[PDB]
Amino acid sequence: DQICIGYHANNSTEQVDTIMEKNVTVTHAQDILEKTHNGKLCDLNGVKPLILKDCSVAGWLLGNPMCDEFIRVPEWSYIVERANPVNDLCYPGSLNDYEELKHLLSRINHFEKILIIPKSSWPNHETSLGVSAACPYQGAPSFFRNVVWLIKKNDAYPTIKISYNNTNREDLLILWGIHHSNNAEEQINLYKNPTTYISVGTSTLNQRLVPKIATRSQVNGQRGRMDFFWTILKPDDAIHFESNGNFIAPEYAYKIVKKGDSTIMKSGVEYGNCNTKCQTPVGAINSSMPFHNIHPLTIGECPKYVKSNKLVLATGLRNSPLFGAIAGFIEGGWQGMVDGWYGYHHSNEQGSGYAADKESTQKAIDGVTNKVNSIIDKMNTQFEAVGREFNNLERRIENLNKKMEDGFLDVWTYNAELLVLMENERTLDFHDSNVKNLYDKVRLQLRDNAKELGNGCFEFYHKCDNECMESVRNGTYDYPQYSEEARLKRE
């Protein structure tokens, strides 16, 4: 007659890592790293992204004629721009503080284009001749839609003085520009006056622009340049303009009607007619895992990004093909013990069977669950990357930005890989201890009434029927009741 302490084995090939041993097969594991995406740009909680196709943000806001698709756009969840849009500033030049502007757009979900200065407001200047073959529309010269390129009328450009007062209740993005002509003759020919300026005044803005009449390379057919500027006009402030030439006046402006979470993804992946809680530049994520390795730049309800390829938490025991029990003095585990991690096998008159020890098994489930939860929960406050953009002469700052973001990525990747690695080791040892402690609880009850065989089995010196077995499995084994019989059975 005998009773045995043993543990679970099953047909698992799930594998796990520790500091001392790699690729350890365990009975149960939990993967915590999301490795797949759907290869598509999607809606984000049923709000579709503004996809700019081949337009730059600047092309959109100034109203490049190739960007008409975007003349009026519903509220967006995120903005999508290609790496090198082709439609962007058809007439060459620049948008000042372009990247600071894009930084504003990343907290904006909706604009409403309003007309603030109609062509009616310009009766002594020419509002229709301000076009270029650099900005074709329908096989003819055209221009940016949101601004007007004012030209002289009757061989005269009298001085413009116009104010505009923001009587909307929201912030207003206004854009305007200056034209740098190529030479003294071109300047007379467009504007009459040789020497010219633009004055722009706000409560906070005080700007004076003067044309640089100079010789440059042809870009998109033009040696001329147009430099654009912008400002937020707060509710109840006014903007004042003065110019006696080279002025590219605002026609429309953008009222900021909804702020919130957004971003400007750089991506050329297609829209997928689908919805998601979480979007990256390479595809969207449908997952409950705490971590992923898809891309550092995400928006939505997101797993936390790390640079790993595998990240599995051991929950159960080392599987069969520090405390000395598991794969030690108990040689392997039991396929036949299906209903618990640790338990008993008994052999007697009435036969045999496996039975989980439920108390000690619940303890271990409790603890392993709280470990997983503690590990998930501690990694809620990791770093999250944010796209920021830098122009050509901010390379120091761009490099600093990149190192800082990679810096935290490496720290958080290390922290995650190592915590898993260390806690896996502890989890295997925990199991090994739980089993040694179970074997010891039995050893202590029996004492001299049975022989330790040294492989985790107790051979009884008396007869142990089924209710005597259940007595050992629940810690109520009456030692005196069998001691005499046990006495006799020695020698």
Ligand X SMILES: CC(=O)N[C@H]1[C@H]([C@H](O)[C@H](O)CO)O[C@@](O)(C(=O)O)C[C@@H]1O
Ligand Y SMILES: CC(=O)N[C@@H]1[C@@H](O)[C@H](O)[C@@H](CO)O[C@H]1O
Ligand Z SMILES: OC[C@H]1O[C@@H](O)[C@H](O)[C@@H](O)[C@H]1O
Q: Which residues of this chain interact with ligand Y, rule CB under 6 A?
A: 11, 13, 22-23, 165, 217, 236-238, 467, 470-471, 474, 476
After which residues, if any, is the chain broken (C to N > 2.5 Å)? Answer: 321
Q: Which residues contact 134 (CB under 8 A, 6 or more apart)?
A: 90, 91, 92, 220, 221, 222
Residue 236 or 452: the one with the smaller Cβ distance to ligand Y is 236
**242 interface partner picked from ligand X, a second copy, ligand Z, none, CB below 5 to 8 A per type:** a second copy
Site string for ligand Z, 153-192 (x = CB under 6 A): -----------------------------x---x------
By CB under 6 A, which span of 178-186, 206-214, 243-251, 346-354 interacts with ligand X? 178-186
Does 246 interact with ligand X (rule: CB under 6 A)?
no
Min dist CB 476 to ligand Y, Å, is 4
**188 interface partner picked from ligand Y, ligand X, ligand Z, none, CB below 5 to 8 A per type:** none
Residue 148 or 264: the one with the smaller Cβ distance to ligand X is 148
Among 18, 64, 142, 222, binds ligand X (CB under 6 A): 222
Among 170, 389, 459, 470, binds a second copy (CB under 8 A): 389
CA nearest neighbour of 306 among 420, 388, 410, 380: 410
Residue 133 or 404: the one with the smaller Cβ distance to a second copy is 404
- Tokens 């995400």 belong to which residue? 298
Min dist CB 237 to a second copy, Å, is 6
DSSP state of 320: P
Scanning 72-145, the segments in alpha helix (DSSP H) are 98-105
- Tokens 């044309």 belong to which residue? 211
Measured between alpha carbons, how far is 196 from 194 in angstroms, rounded to an integer?
7
Among 73, 104, 302, 355, binds a second copy (CB under 8 A): 104
Among 59, 130, 303, 456, binds ligand X (CB under 6 A): 130
The answer to whether 453 touches 328, Cβ cutoff 8 Å, is no
Neighbours of 470 (CB within 10 A): 14
Q: Which residues contact 480 (CB under 8 A, 6 or more apart)?
A: none
Number of residues lying near a second copy (CB under 8 A): 96
The length of the chain in residues reads 491
Burial of 41 (0-12, 13-18, 19+ CB in 10 A): buried
By CB under 6 A, which span of 128-136, 196-204, 297-305, 427-435 interacts with ligand X? 128-136
Measured between alpha carbons, how far is 93 from 77 in angstroms, rounded to an integer?
30
Measured between alpha carbons, how far is 420 from 424 in angstroms, rounded to an integer?
6
Q: Which of residues 454-483 bind a second copy (CB under 8 A)?
A: 454
Min dist CB 42 to ligand X, Å, is 41
**132 interface partner picked from ligand Y, ligand X, a second copy, none, CB below 5 to 8 A per type:** ligand X
Q: Which of residues 287-326 bind a second copy (CB under 8 A)?
A: 307, 322-324
Q: Give me the residues paired with residue 279 across strands.
A: 284, 299
Q: Give me the residues paired with residue 427 across strands.
A: none
Q: Phi and psi (nearest 5°) for 398? A: -60, -35
Residue 166 or 276: the one with the smaller Cβ distance to a second copy is 166
Min dist CB 418 to a second copy, Å, is 6
Site string for a second copy, 226-265 (x = CB under 8 A): -x---------xx-x-x-----------------------
Return the structure tokens found at 129.
Answer: 């001749």
Name the residue type at position 458: F
- Tokens 């020419």 belong to which residue? 126
Return the structure tokens found at 305.
Answer: 């990004």
Q: Tell me the chain's radius of gyration from C-alpha atoms.
A: 38
Residue 121 or 182: the one with the smaller Cβ distance to ligand Z is 182
Q: Which of residues 421-440 bind a second copy (CB under 8 A)?
A: 421-423, 426, 430, 433, 436-437, 440
Give all strands (DSSP E) within 12-78, no chain letters: 15-16, 24-25, 29-31, 33-34, 41-44, 50-51
Min dist CB 145 to ligand Y, Å, is 27
Helix axes 358-378, 395-446, angle to 10 degrees: 170
Site string for ligand X, 348-377 (x = CB under 6 A): ------------------------------
Residue 70 or 247: the one with the smaller Cβ distance to a second copy is 247
**Under the rule (CB under 6 A), what is the footprint of ligand X?**
129-134, 141, 149, 151, 181-182, 186, 190, 222, 224
**Residue numbers at the binding site for ligand Z (CB under 6 A):** 182, 186, 222
